[PDB]
Amino acid sequence: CPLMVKVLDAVRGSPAINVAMHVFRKAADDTWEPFASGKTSESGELHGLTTEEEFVEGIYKVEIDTKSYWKALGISPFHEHAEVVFTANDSGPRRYTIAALLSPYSYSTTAVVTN
Amino acid sequence: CPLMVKVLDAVRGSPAINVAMHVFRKAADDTWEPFASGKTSESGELHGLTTEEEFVEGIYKVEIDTKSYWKALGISPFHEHAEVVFTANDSGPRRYTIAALLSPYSYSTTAVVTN
Ligand SMILES: CCc1oc2ccccc2c1C(=O)c1cc(Br)c(O)c(Br)c1
Ligand SMILES: CCc1oc2ccccc2c1C(=O)c1cc(Br)c(O)c(Br)c1
Ligand SMILES: [Ca+2]
């Protein structure tokens, strides 16, 4: 699992379940092409997005549909979504966890990059 | 001042000075039209991006160039930028402060909306 995404809810103190997201890779045309997608599990985690062979260096964007998450709960959000844009670099072995912590008017994201 | 952006550095405990950012507005054809741009001052704040008449209803994106900020300090950060996308003024004019707190592998954004 070269890339995993985990989403947490700071209002309810729980995993953010059934959160949809799409992952894009930047194309030579400087356009965003779909690469992978899914919805978070009951643990708030989305595994199996890609494979080691498929996850090459480049610029990736994870677009998390936070607005639909807050709407299903009845809570009025600020953001249309949460975009996380980063460069994947293949110098030495690296596995990536992208995490997002969600509030209606705030979000935090961090990367946990391990060998 | 209907839209202000404040950026802080969580490594140094200081305002994030001279941080560039670009604001875009979603056009009718679903493309991002340039709206305004600027750099944070010595207080980490960017004022004067727009006016009440220019800042109409719509979907806006703030793209903060955190990568150039970190690289100028000798740090290789994870993210290409910190983006904030939100609907503005849908229930009438509001004043928006967009704040971002920056670390090399993490950022947070929040919005303070007043009427
Ligand atoms: C931006 C997402 C985020 O917000 C936080 C606030 C306090 C502490 C950790 C985090 C955090 C994480 O990165 C995080 C990452 C992993 Br992996 C976890 O298993 C758990 Br749990 C939390
Ligand atoms: C994501 C930006 C952010 O991160 C935080 C972490 C702890 C406390 C406040 C913040 C915070 C702010 O919103 C913030 C907003 C204003 Br306005 C400020 O003048 C100051 Br200073 C900080
Ligand atoms: Ca790789």
Cβ(B97) to ligand 2 under 6 A? yes
Q: Which residues pair with B85 in a beta bridge?
A: A81, B61
- A58 to chain B: closest CA residue: B80
- Tell the residue number behind the tokens 């009438």, with chain if given: B92
Interacting residues of A35 by C-beta distance below 8 A, sequence separation 6+? A23, A24, A25, A50, A60
Here the tokens at position B13 are 């405990």
Q: Residue A108 in contact with residue B108, Cβ under 8 Å?
A: yes
**Euclidean distance between CA atoms A108 and A6, whole angstroms:** 12
What separation in Å is there between the alpha carbon of A4 and the centre of ligand 3?
Answer: 13
Cβ(A6) to ligand 1 under 6 A? yes
Beta strands in B1-115 (DSSP E): 3-9, 14-15, 20-26, 32-39, 45-46, 58-64, 79-88, 95-103, 106-114
**Which one of A79, A89, A91, A113 would you mutate to disrupt binding with B, by most B Cβ within 10 Å of its Cβ?**
A79
Three-state SS at A93: coil
Closest-CA distance, A9 to chain B, in angstroms, reads: 14
Whose C-alpha lies nearest to ligand 1, atom 22? A99
Here the tokens at position A11 are 């209002």
Using most ligand atoms within 8 A of CB, pick from B8, B14, B84 the residue to mutate for ligand 2. Answer: B8
- Within chain B, where are the H helices? 66-72
Could you tell me which residues of A are annotated as the binding site for L-thyroxine?
6, 45, 108
Which one, of A67, A71, A60, lies nearest residue A81 by Cα? A67
Q: What is the CATH number of the domain that holds A14?
A: 2.60.40.180
Three-state SS at A68: helix
Mark yes or no for CB contact A106/B109 under 8 Å: yes
- B112 to chain A: closest CA residue: A105
**Which one of B32, B57, B109, B112 would you mutate to disrupt binding with A, by most A Cβ within 10 Å of its Cβ?**
B109
- Tell the residue number behind the tokens 């045309």, with chain if given: A29
Our CA dihedral for A81, A105, A49, B82, rounded to 10 degrees, sits at 80
The helices-and-strands tally (H runs, E runs) of chain A is 1, 9
Q: In this structure, which amino acid lies at residue A93?
A: P
Q: Which residues pair with B99 in a beta bridge?
A: B6, B110
**Phi, psi of A46, deg, nearest 5:** -125, 110
- B86 to chain A: closest CA residue: A79
- Taking CB atoms and an 8 Å cutoff, what residues of chain A touch B103? 110
Beta strands in chain A (DSSP E): 3-9, 14-15, 20-26, 32-39, 45-46, 58-64, 79-88, 95-103, 106-114
Q: In this structure, which amino acid lies at residue B70?
A: W
- Taking CB atoms and an 8 Å cutoff, what residues of chain A touch B79? 84-86, 109, 111
Here the tokens at position A35 are 């690469």
The number of domains in chain B is: 1
Range(s) of the domain holding residue A108: 1-115
This PDB structure is determined at a resolution in Å of 1.8
- Tell the residue number behind the tokens 């839209």, with chain if given: B3
Per DSSP, A73 falls in state H
